[PDB]
Structure 1
Amino acid sequence: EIVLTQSPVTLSLSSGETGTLSCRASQNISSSWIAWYQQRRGQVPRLLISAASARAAGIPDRFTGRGSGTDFTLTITRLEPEDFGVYSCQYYGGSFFTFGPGTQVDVKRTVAAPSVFIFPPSDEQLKSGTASVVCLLNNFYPREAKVQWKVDNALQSGNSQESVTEQDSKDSTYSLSSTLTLSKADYEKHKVYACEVTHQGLSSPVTKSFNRGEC
């Protein structure tokens, strides 16, 4: 099986800046079977380039695809605000097609550490037999953020979901929620609830926590 990987995860650029996106194949492949797609905020993917370098009809000059063998790149020279989105490479050779994981290009900005807030479950919800603990990371940049839940110093895995806002139009920051879902019985069996946040804007991870019953 041929698998495609992409780098970086999030590429930060400003209007007029040039950046290069990378697509690596697991094997040596013909450049005739590589394509690049563009996904904007709310619409279908759009073909930008096929056969590694052949620009599709109507695609502006700013997009240039290069590469052969295993390393394939997509360059955006003087990007306009309409170029911000997610770009995915594709291999359409052989019988099985595959796409890379995608690369998001977002508006560049100075680093901004997150403000971390934690909320206990309401007594109203606890009556229903469930408990939701919410960790809020407000107005941060860049996008990469790590949130870990610890319940009495026990790392939680598989019982939390996180959602992120789109990059803000004014200050170009992100906000993130991480919601830990526990049953009523499990929530009362433990005392200390903490969300630990790791982020480039933070010199050290920040831990926001509370003690159940006292909160």
Structure 2
Amino acid sequence: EIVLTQSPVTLSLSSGETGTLSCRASQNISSSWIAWYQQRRGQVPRLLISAASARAAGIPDRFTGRGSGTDFTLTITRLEPEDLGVYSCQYYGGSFFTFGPGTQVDVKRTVAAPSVFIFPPSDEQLKSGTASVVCLLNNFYPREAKVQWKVDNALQSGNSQESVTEQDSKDSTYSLSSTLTLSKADYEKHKVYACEVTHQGLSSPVTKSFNRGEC
């Protein structure tokens, strides 16, 4: 059971900066069986480095792999826009191959707190049997953000889905939508619907809320 971990979760760099991605093995492993892959958005993954440090053919000199034992690193120097994507380490020794969770490399910018909005269910949806409550986090940075739903101060779990836009090409920000799915019956039994947002750009978590029936 060889498990690879990676750090950081997201690496933010400006054009021309240098970044170092880390891969950590569960136990000692030989450098002969470690690889790094690059995946740009929408494209197929591509081999960058094999045997920990051997650069694949056609791969530019900006990428260099190093490491031994349990610590392996990939260094990107003179970062260029084509280098934006997800980088994953792989162990291909033994019988069962495994990949690291991947590290995202995105464009660096200053911190921006999200603008938070909450939308009640429309009446046209309530006459259909379901109720959707939507929470919008607009134009924030960094990517990391937490959203917690609360119905009459009761924390919700398992009944929400969220999706995130790609990093915007103009302002380098993200936007996030979280959707709470409720039945009409359960929606009509409660009043206060609150979306609580935690982000680096906020001194403290922000809560947007509405009362069912404009109360």
Q: Is the TM value for this pair above 0.5?
A: yes
* 1:109 positional shift: 0.2
- Taking the aligned partners of 1:145 and 1:29, their CA distance within structure 2 comes to 35
SS of match in other structure, 1:15: coil
* 1:113 positional shift: 0.5
* 1:71 positional shift: 0.6
Corresponding residue of 1:144: 144
Aligned positions, number: 215
* 1:41 positional shift: 1.2
Gaps of 5+ in 1: none
* 1:42 positional shift: 1.3
Per-residue CA deviation, residues 96-136 of structure 1 (Å, 9 max, x unaligned), is 00001100000000000100000000000011100000000
Corresponding residue of 1:190: 190
- The correspondence of residues 26-45 of structure 1 with structure 2, limited to 5 A, is 26-45=26-45
Corresponding residue of 1:67: 67
* 1:61 positional shift: 0.4
- Taking the aligned partners of 2:44 and 2:148, their CA distance within structure 1 comes to 33
- Taking the aligned partners of 1:188 and 1:24, their CA distance within structure 2 comes to 50
* 1:208 positional shift: 0.3
SS of match in other structure, 2:105: strand
User: Once superposed, which parts of structure 1, at least 4 consecutive aligned residues long, lie more than 3 Å away?
Assistant: none
**TM-score between both structures, scaled by the size of structure 2:** 0.99
* 1:214 positional shift: 1.8
Per-residue CA deviation, residues 137-165 of structure 1 (Å, 9 max, x unaligned), is 00000000001101111111110000000
Identical pairs, percent: 100
Per-residue CA deviation, residues 35-65 of structure 1 (Å, 9 max, x unaligned), is 0000001110000000000000000000011
Say yes or no: does 1:52 pair with 2:52. yes
- Taking the aligned partners of 2:127 and 2:189, their CA distance within structure 1 comes to 16
- Taking the aligned partners of 1:167 and 1:30, their CA distance within structure 2 comes to 37
Query: C-alpha root-mean-square deviation of aligned residues, in Å?
Result: 0.7
- Taking the aligned partners of 1:102 and 1:186, their CA distance within structure 2 comes to 39
SS of match in other structure, 2:155: coil
SS of match in other structure, 1:124: helix
SS of match in other structure, 1:198: strand
